[PDB]
Amino acid sequence: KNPKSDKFKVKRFHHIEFWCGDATNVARRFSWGLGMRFSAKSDLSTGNMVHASYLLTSGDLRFLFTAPYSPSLSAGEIKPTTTASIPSFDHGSCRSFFSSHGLGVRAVAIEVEDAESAFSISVANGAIPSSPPIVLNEAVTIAEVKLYGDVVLRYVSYKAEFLPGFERVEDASSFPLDYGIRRLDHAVGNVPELGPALTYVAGFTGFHQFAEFESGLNSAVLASNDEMVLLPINEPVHGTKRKSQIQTYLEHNEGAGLQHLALMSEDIFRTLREMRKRSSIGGFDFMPSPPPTYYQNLKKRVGDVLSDDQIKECEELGILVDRDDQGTLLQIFTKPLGDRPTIFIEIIQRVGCMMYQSGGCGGFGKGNFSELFKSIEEYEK
């Protein structure tokens, strides 16, 4: 059931912003590892004396990497005279965030019809304000409210090119990498207590619970009206035999924060071939693959959706498969993106639910918890 209860008009995920200590090195690493092109910049070369921000794109997916300069470069500025292109940026907040959490997502940004309205309605319905609406060059409005931990939900609305004050990157510096990633499918937070987190976020957005179908977690998914903005949230389950990886996250992250970003691929086999080629030469590593019993068990579960060749291709690449009542999900997870065992990436492709494809087709892979356990014990044999 979908009550379509959004309290303001939400369009799509717009961008994800990482707060970094050095934006250049993270952006270059991510660009090569994920096949994303350098598309825009805001930094000293564009007159920004406050922060260095670099935008990577692949299809509609936008990853922004931002780090603070020395405050001394902008010590004469005030907010009315700022050279920052993102007016919510604050040196102290950014240094505090990165010293507390390490490299991670500061902003989950969604595009909306009217960011000022979304902010006002959100705060009127319990959202904790983080940065009030500001109109950039009379063209774009940005506003921010707290989501969980030190992660903000950022509203962006356009009157009619990323943000004013960003410059498009020269084609010499803009190599057209592309491994098939096309958009952000969902963004997942880890919190100590799931109940209060859902009440808060659903309270100020009107997002509804997306219907699903001991591994250390309880989770629920909040969704916009057309279920294209998807925000799952996890809490740890305590007292298990294997310590909850949600609790490990909370400890190493110094509390709640973004756990993983799921990136839709138009061809997950190509994406994984290209990413795995680069794992040991600057790119991303993947979690250890399931045993062959897992793929031997896939025929009985998805043999009507994937051929034997397509299943064997999943086994080569370590891809996981799950299914709901409406569609099928192919997914795989990276190892953590940085030093701490906190944030990681999921690559996904969804098959089914054609009307365009409806959001969340095939679910989020919760069935893969038990089937992985089954396969390991099976392969033990």
Added chain:
Amino acid sequence: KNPKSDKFKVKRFHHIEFWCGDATNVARRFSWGLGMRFSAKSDLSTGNMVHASYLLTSGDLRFLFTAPYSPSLSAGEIKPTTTASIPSFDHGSCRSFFSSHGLGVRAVAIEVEDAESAFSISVANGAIPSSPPIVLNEAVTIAEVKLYGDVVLRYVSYKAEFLPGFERVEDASSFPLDYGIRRLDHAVGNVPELGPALTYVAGFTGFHQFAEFESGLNSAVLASNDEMVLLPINEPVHGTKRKSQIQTYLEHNEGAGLQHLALMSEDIFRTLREMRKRSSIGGFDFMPSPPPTYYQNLKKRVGDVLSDDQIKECEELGILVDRDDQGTLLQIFTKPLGDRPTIFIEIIQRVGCMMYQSGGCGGFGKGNFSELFKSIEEYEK
């Protein structure tokens, strides 16, 4: 003239340590950009609850990348019970360094016969102590004194495998990249005042001035007995028409620090081909190349050392050439390694001074200041 006045026995450059906010992303970027292999690690997976440290190697060149974990992981530890593999590490120092300077070199490490003696003799001769000698697993001794800014000169001595507590990296995670870089040739600092800096460092090391032969700088080079440890230092020249890039460094770095690392290649043409292939796909960018007048002028200056083909190959790759009275230098400079216009890398190869090759053969390229200016005005035409 070389008085061989070292106050203690110095061997070779041992490693360079970068202090990072996220060591993983910087190390992976550097590995791909420079062709260095992942060779050792000290991190959560090796029992280090304090800092993540990753070692890259190419030939004898060793780059170490270190970042702090949350202090909470090690809040129960004291120095007697520390799990840090580098006992000089301090969370607060590292966060302060990176927030002040951005990504940059914390330690210039040289191998010595006896790090405890080197420390004692250094401090007895004016060195400001930074970390006293500590013996690691009865096998290696490390000590640190201040060099300039927040950069330390690190002494390492071995009784008889990087450092105790580091583990060699699995070959799966250890791709054998190699673009030809083989060792650190010299490490260069920028200071506000050259005179006091040389007096200080030469005072506690016994290093001697290496003999040389308005562009915004004055420089001098300190050298060990066999002139294999080479430490140039620059100060700005004020009041010029073009603002000194040394002064820009000092402003963006928040004071003195390491300006560039010169990395010797056994085949600079191969190194530059391989590095330039990767500039726009995660590696390093190079400074804009000199005009063809520069290479048209190279025949008259080094036509007896390089063939026309070898000169044309320099023009393809943007390589600079200089010469002293004993040898010839091929060199090229990267753009800054990170967000700030501070640290960069030089790639060099030296030809001549065969006896082995003596240190500093061909100098440091100070002749390329005027010859570049000449070439630009010539090419203006």
